[PDB]
Design a protein around this ligand. Structure first.
Ligand SMILES: *[C@@H]1O[C@H](CO)[C@@H](O[C@@H]2O[C@H](CO)[C@@H](O[C@@H]3O[C@H](CO)[C@@H](O)[C@H](O)[C@@H]3O)[C@H](O)[C@H]2NC(C)=O)[C@H](O)[C@H]1NC(C)=O
Ligand SMILES: *[C@@H]1O[C@H](CO)[C@@H](O[C@@H]2O[C@H](CO)[C@@H](O[C@@H]3O[C@H](CO)[C@@H](O)[C@H](O)[C@@H]3O)[C@H](O)[C@H]2NC(C)=O)[C@H](O)[C@H]1NC(C)=O
Ligand SMILES: *[C@@H]1O[C@H](CO)[C@@H](O[C@@H]2O[C@H](CO)[C@@H](O[C@@H]3O[C@H](CO)[C@@H](O)[C@H](O)[C@@H]3O)[C@H](O)[C@H]2NC(C)=O)[C@H](O)[C@H]1NC(C)=O
Ligand SMILES: *[C@@H]1O[C@H](CO)[C@@H](O[C@@H]2O[C@H](CO)[C@@H](O[C@@H]3O[C@H](CO)[C@@H](O)[C@H](O)[C@@H]3O)[C@H](O)[C@H]2NC(C)=O)[C@H](O)[C@H]1NC(C)=O
Ligand SMILES: *[C@@H]1O[C@H](CO)[C@@H](O[C@@H]2O[C@H](CO)[C@@H](O[C@@H]3O[C@H](CO)[C@@H](O)[C@H](O)[C@@H]3O)[C@H](O)[C@H]2NC(C)=O)[C@H](O)[C@H]1NC(C)=O
Ligand SMILES: *[C@@H]1O[C@H](CO)[C@@H](O[C@H]2O[C@H](CO)[C@@H](O[C@@H]3O[C@H](CO)[C@@H](O)[C@H](O)[C@@H]3O)[C@H](O)[C@H]2NC(C)=O)[C@H](O)[C@H]1NC(C)=O
Ligand SMILES: *[C@@H]1O[C@H](CO)[C@@H](O[C@H]2O[C@H](CO)[C@@H](O[C@@H]3O[C@H](CO)[C@@H](O)[C@H](O)[C@@H]3O)[C@H](O)[C@H]2NC(C)=O)[C@H](O)[C@H]1NC(C)=O
Lengths: 427, 162, 162, 427, 162, 427
């Protein structure tokens, strides 16, 4: 007897009807095509090998109590050029009674924890008590030049020529001497005895190399004393105050000349010092100044200026009890290419109050991983072209784009049954 | 219009009963309907579904890591741009989803046509004009043994023609 | 090569004459071509065309109001952006038009395959291998009555075999 | 006998061949997928329930001759905060011989018909005849602050401290008194008999709330008298003219000091008054002024500043016979977030010459409908993602994009016949 | 599962042997395989391949000169914008390549179904159910002559039925 | 007996498997979808009929030694408005002892080879030996106005009114006369004999048309003499130096007035002349000047200002032995809408050292072909929507976009074999 057999499809219980072009499809379960990625708080790096850091006491591998004292891991710390008590600003200006160090290195991404060692607590008063503006402006320029360089190094000495008429100065508010960057020199000049001195002329040569380091641009500080008035200067000098920086050609590039510009002080018999930040290319420069004062700059930072790249700047502030400034923050936020890392909770250290903060550690934890994107909103090492929402303006790497999970496609899963013609679904 | 058993192109809603792929059989001009599970070619269909899913996986990877490696140093906003790019890429995802569903569907249907061919190949007497994915056989010619071989793949005693 | 009556896949240009869907018949080695309207089969085709048009409507609505709600306060121009977005969206519209036309076409063709199936199902003697969308029947066996039932859907006196 | 039957497809008369992927398609007729939408001239609103208007006499529901007089419908007019003869500028400065009112309200979209009641015709000369610049600058700030606020209110009273030496002023060109915002106060000073006076110090408090209204920013007018010279002031004073507004800390935020800035007048023995527009935060402020003149501000506009939102400004000009300025137009066109509505035919009213203009009615007709987009090119409540050409830059809602009809896809219509494989079309 | 000769849907890797389109024949339950070139059927396929290539050409011309006429007088950079447009247009090109390949493939396959029809039409006894693109004929009934006519298009002495 | 026949597809030797939707495809060979187009060096034009050129001696068709001497073809040269020894600057200011000509024409694209004839070599010293700055600024304005105009013409005469007191001047450093644009006139004034003069008032009328040429904007030179001091002027004139240009209303639009402005010279007893470039609309203008000097401008360039359009500027420099300046280059590079064509090899002419340069010829060859895009990177007449990399910012026409050949789709070629469903590929 004839029997009819058919291969039948029947759809049961829980099912989704995925719509297409050229047949539709039934499936029992369904799931999302992509999963939204999230940026993780703190700092991390791309490539995990093309980066370099400039450190303090909390990134120092030679710290006796290191694990405790450290705001970073050992792994992370290895890429740093550290020294306990150190600061870029301390090596830049070399104030007496503080540490001094040759900061230098190369890399695509530069990581700074600079600042805390020259905060208001440090109490430098070499004719200037509030360092904050100088610190800020110095940092701003460091960040600027660094996010545009591959290699950088401190320049702790340079070529100079001083005229025999003047000999090295000292100041009681600058411990027992004077700074290692603006070098003070004076000659005998006494207006009352009518023993009037001569203007100074001195030379200096900025080197276009510093060992292996290639110097295409130098960050130097042009400093000078700001006197209140005529009468005040005229106690100690017969003429008028002036300190001016000339180039090789004969053009002036900075300083203060009170033979042609009015006096602007407010510190009485004693003046107050102002240091302007200048960017200078290598060559033979000259300086001129009034008889009683010569302030030759003898230090600078050397930048190769080769390529642009990320810069991370960590908020370098003290533990409890020590007065801190926000120069770091301010400077970063006013220069492009740097990402600021800042603390939401107070700084409370393990080793002592100023070293080994809990928060800072779980932020700088990322520096041991290899990120696929880093942004001012955080870092990510996980893949996926999407994120819940947009990441803050400066960002580097393979960026994820903003999208809603409800708008992501769904993929059929479990039991799948194909529809064909118009015959296909009976009811 | 076929009665209570219908072809392979068809799919019927049976929410609380038996579902998936099943063998629907009954006598021509007579006896009731018999329905029973196909759990043995489903590894074939299913295995082919894994190959289809392999395609899916690939195509999904091909949409991952598409955007270029940035190095934005400026603090300027690009949200209005990101939005316009996202709205476009979202549209693209819509299209390729519908395209993928159809391509998968089609390739899945063609694996049901491999079963037809194989079952038809198994016994000469299985070749007949009936309905898409339906066939007719005679119980005076082929017993349980050969039927069980032919479409339940048990390899039991093939049909004797003399 | 088939003659003056050709399959369902085919469409012939008959610019000044009868168009649409029609039944093209003649005898094998005998009586000439007879052509007459398929409007009894069309009730299915037509209804499926409505279902297809429902799909269209939906898909068009799905492309309405896509772009987000703006609140632009700035007086600066964005024309270069509007242009580049329009050129892209225009490209998308091109693609989905060709895709829709094929999908519609295909689904329409599949509704002609429901007629085949139904007509074949109506009488056993209608099952024969001929040409895609063509069949052969015997006028000794089946008269106007059963023919009129079989493919003109008028249910008049079914075919007798003895 | 064997007879062959075929289901044939044949195409006839008018037919179009639509191309695809996976077969083509024939159809007898065809039409466009999307119709291009048009922006309609006039003003309309989104959401039709989150908007508020500030009115005059032509938006006034209490006007006896309303229907005739009205440039708006009754439905529309109800969302307005109106008053016949009103004006924001009239309530802001409160000049004598004019109306006084308390404009206030909240909304996502603010609609202004402000201006006409203080045009050159209105006749105010409280030491200033041409009000246009003041009007303009005032409007500019109103529009600015309003397109950045949810709630706004006039402030017609505040906390003050006036010193016993001065007593309330009056002026013959300011009718029989003086303004209700800059409050004049004077003491005796006579240079001829050397009966010289004392400089004034007076306080005032801007409140952070005004009933329900939240004040995060106040729009105040700092005013002062501009004298021709030393000698001219020195007729009535023994010192020099000055009126200056200080903050709570003690810094100056506005005014004029002729003890240090030269005399800039040109009006002779009588001065001319200048009122500068200032944006002030809530708190306790102080003012200082010369013996003979104290001008304390006693009014302002209070803004909550919560959210950005649309602003419509209608060209508030007079019917024929009364002189009108273009302050409204100018102010809007120079501030972001506002849309200007302006006439293309003269203002001819039904009720009287100045109320119930035909044109204006068919323009402000849209305000009763709920638009899906509103732009400086018009409004639309009709669907479709496309329009013939681009709409002017400030626009709000679901925007239609520019497209040409000739490139819009066509949809098959009438009789449809599917093409299949390569066999499919014979000839 | 079919044996040493398999259907038209199939394509077999024969890297160092005969390729293209060929006639694979053998006896049913007897003598071994004979393989030989199909260059007489190919005259159809080949011409259709040209028609298909004509479509391609058109579609390529249609993608040429799509960006409108520029008049940039400003000296400022738009590379980052041009880049984002290129990334989109590149994506679009990917899609339409896969779409084109399928459409071409399909239309090519349908021209092999035109050969079936013609060969089947050539001799009535050639109509039989075997495997997709395979047929069975009897050499008792038809010699070289009619075979050579039937599928090698050489019109030699057609098959007699008595 | 029953024999089974199958139509088999077999793939052999070299084959590529092109992936799709709805089946894949095998092909024996494959090639790229689009060939990347290249931007050819040199200058060329779009539409080859809406362009016009302004020429010199190397573009002059009447030059006896043309073919040799020419930096262009004859075909190309025909679209130029040339003249041997010519220059726009020479016709603009008309210096004595130099060629005079009427440059003029219309077109969407203007091509300049202007400059070489008034380079430092040319030796004009009419109270100014270094013409470069004037040349530069003049060229900048010509390019600027030209990339915003359709028609342009030189204006070598205008309507004027001179007062009877002054009579025409001459200058020994200006050969035997003076310039044909600033026209010098003086009266007899002797300070020592107290034969002091009267200040001059003179008029001039800028015309709105010049033949068929339409003048919407005129490019005129406002010139004046710069004297070292009071005393120096007081040798030749009792009062003070001054030359000032007023409008129709009575406002001042240019000049120098040393009755109020200090003397800025550095040329001693003889002054030095400065000519500032002014853009003036048609009307009746007036000038006032000190007794001893009147400098009325009598020439200008007239621009219709109708439409924006491309401008090509060729580096017009001399052969070996005549000093050349880069005014042309500088001027173009500081104006938008112009494309600069410059030489990478020295100027070595065939005819003489200064005419018929090899390089210039292999650059300006493109001007005979019809380009489909022209850019600062070069031109292209070939089709294809892609090129290796982005073309330099100013560019016109159907731009090709940047792409990598390795990412361009590949098209199947040779023998093609279609894949079907799951069954299709056996192994
Ligand atoms: C991407 O970065 C994430 C972190 O943001 C990495 O996840 C962490 O992976 C480490 C191993 O590499 C896991 O550490 C292990 O944790 C277990 C459990 O606490 C412990 O027993 C082990 O000794 C070890 O510490 C860690 O769990 C995991 N983080 C989380 C949240 O699960 C990830 O590995 C990175 N991937 C790549 C490829 O860079
Ligand atoms: C739609 O119907 C299909 C049947 O064709 C469902 O598949 C069957 O799902 C049940 C779910 O409980 C599976 O049962 C489990 O069997 C294992 C042994 O394999 C046993 O150890 C468990 O205790 C349980 O009974 C069953 O295996 C499965 N069929 C096959 C062939 O695997 C399907 O799940 C239904 N749809 C939905 C949404 O449930
Ligand atoms: C292509 O041919 C088809 C035939 O299959 C045309 O359809 C037929 O169009 C005529 C047009 O007049 C319709 O005739 C009208 O019939 C109604 C009754 O339904 C009658 O009241 C009128 O007076 C008239 O005779 C006819 O209905 C229609 N066929 C069907 C099945 O509806 C088609 O219009 C042709 N193409 C073009 C572009 O004309
Ligand atoms: C894959 O196999 C096919 C066969 O179906 C190859 O086609 C054959 O290729 C040879 C290549 O030399 C052709 O022979 C040549 O014929 C020309 C005359 O047309 C002659 O001048 C040459 O000396 C040579 O004998 C042969 O004709 C051709 N088959 C057909 C039908 O034309 C195909 O080339 C193979 N694939 C690859 C990548 O080679
Ligand atoms: C697009 O422009 C190119 C050049 O950039 C055109 O190619 C050149 O076409 C000319 C004729 O118009 C060819 O000239 C001929 O050169 C031969 C070879 O020396 C010579 O014997 C002839 O007397 C004549 O001078 C020239 O060969 C050719 N360029 C190259 C590199 O071969 C091209 O025709 C333009 N196409 C269009 C459609 O505008
Ligand atoms: C549209 O569906 C196609 C299937 O109908 C799909 O191609 C896929 O199937 C083919 C076989 O016909 C695969 O080829 C084999 O792949 C296996 C591994 O999965 C290999 O072992 C074997 O050698 C052979 O290459 C295709 O590889 C497979 N596709 C993928 C991406 O794996 C099409 O890909 C699909 N179209 C799209 C765009 O998804
Ligand atoms: C998807 O493949 C289609 C083929 O299956 C392709 O259409 C092409 O084939 C049709 C015939 O079915 C051509 O129409 C004929 O063209 C010839 C000339 O080549 C004429 O003589 C004749 O009158 C008729 O027009 C199509 O022209 C042809 N396509 C093209 C562009 O030429 C589809 O185009 C293809 N889909 C896409 C988007 O390319």
């Amino acid at each position: 007897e004839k029997i009819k057999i058919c291969l039948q499809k029947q759809v049961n219980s829980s099912f989704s009807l995925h719509n297409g072009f050229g047949g539709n499809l039934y499936a029992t379960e369904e799931k999302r095509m992509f999963e939204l990625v999230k940026p993780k708080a703190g700092a991390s790096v791309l490539n995990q090998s093309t980066w370099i850091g400039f450190g303090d006491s909390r990134t120092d591998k030679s710290n006796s109590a290191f694990p405790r004292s450290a705001d970073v891991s050992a792994k992370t710390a290895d890429k740093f050029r550290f020294l306990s008590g150190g600061s870029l600003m301390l090596s830049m200006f070399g104030p007496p009674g503080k540490v001094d160090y040759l900061y230098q290195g190369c890399g695509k991404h530069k990581v700074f924890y600079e600042g805390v060692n020259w905060s208001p607590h440090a109490a430098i008063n070499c004719y200037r008590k509030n360092w904050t503006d100088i610190k800020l402006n110095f940092q701003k320029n460091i960040y600027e030049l660094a996010s545009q360089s591959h290699c950088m190094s401190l320049v702790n000495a340079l070529d100079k020529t001083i005229p025999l008429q003047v000999t090295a100065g000292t100041a009681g508010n600058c411990n027992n001497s004077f700074l290692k960057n603006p070098a003070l020199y004076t000659q005998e000049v006494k207006p009352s005895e009518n023993k009037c001195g001569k203007e100074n002329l001195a030379f200096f040569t900025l080197p276009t190399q510093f060992g292996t380091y290639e110097c295409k641009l130098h960050l130097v500080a042009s400093c000078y004393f700001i006197y209140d008035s005529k009468e005040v200067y005229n106690k100690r000098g017969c003429d008028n105050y002036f300190q001016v920086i000339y180039d090789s050609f004969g053009k002036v590039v900075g300083g203060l000349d009170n033979r042609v510009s009015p006096y602007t002080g407010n510190s009485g018999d004693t003046p107050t010092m102002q240091c302007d930040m200048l960017q200078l290319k290598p060559g033979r420069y000259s300086v001129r100044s009034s008889p009683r004062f010569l302030l030759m700059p003898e230090r600078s930072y050397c930048f190769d200026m080769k390529e642009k790249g990320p810069v991370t700047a960590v908020q370098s502030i003290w533990g409890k009890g020590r007065e801190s400034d926000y120069a770091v923050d301010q400077a970063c936020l006013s220069t492009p290419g740097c990402m600021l890392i800042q603390k939401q909770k107070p700084y409370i250290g393990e080793a002592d109050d100023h070293h080994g903060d809990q928060e800072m550690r779980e932020l700088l934890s990322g520096l041991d991983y290899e990120a696929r994107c880093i942004s001012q909103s955080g870092w990510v090492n996980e893949t996926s072209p999407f994120t819940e929402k947009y990441l803050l303006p400066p960002k580097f790497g393979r960026c994820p784009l903003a999208a809603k999970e409800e708008s992501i496609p769904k993929i059929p899963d479990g039991l799948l049954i194909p529809t064909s013609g118009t015959d296909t679904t009976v009811t | 219009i076929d009665d209570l058993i219908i072809g392979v192109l068809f799919v019927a809603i049976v929410e609380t009963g038996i579902g998936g792929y099943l063998l629907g059989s009954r006598k021509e001009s007579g006896g009731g309907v018999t329905k029973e599970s196909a759990e043995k070619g489903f590894e074939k269909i299913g295995n082919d579904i894994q190959i289809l899913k392999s395609s899916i996986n690939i195509a999904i990877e091909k949409l991952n890591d598409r955007i270029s490696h940035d190095e934005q140093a400026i603090r300027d906003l690009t949200l209005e741009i990101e939005n316009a790019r996202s709205e476009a890429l979202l549209g693209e995802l819509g299209i390729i989803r519908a395209l993928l569903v159809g391509n998968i569907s089609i390739g899945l249907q063609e694996s049901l046509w491999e079963l037809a061919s194989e079952i038809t190949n198994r016994a000469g007497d299985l070749a007949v004009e009936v309905s898409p994915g339906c066939w007719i056989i005679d119980n005076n010619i082929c017993d349980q043994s050969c039927q069980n071989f032919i479409f339940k793949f048990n390899e039991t005693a093939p049909v004797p023609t003399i």
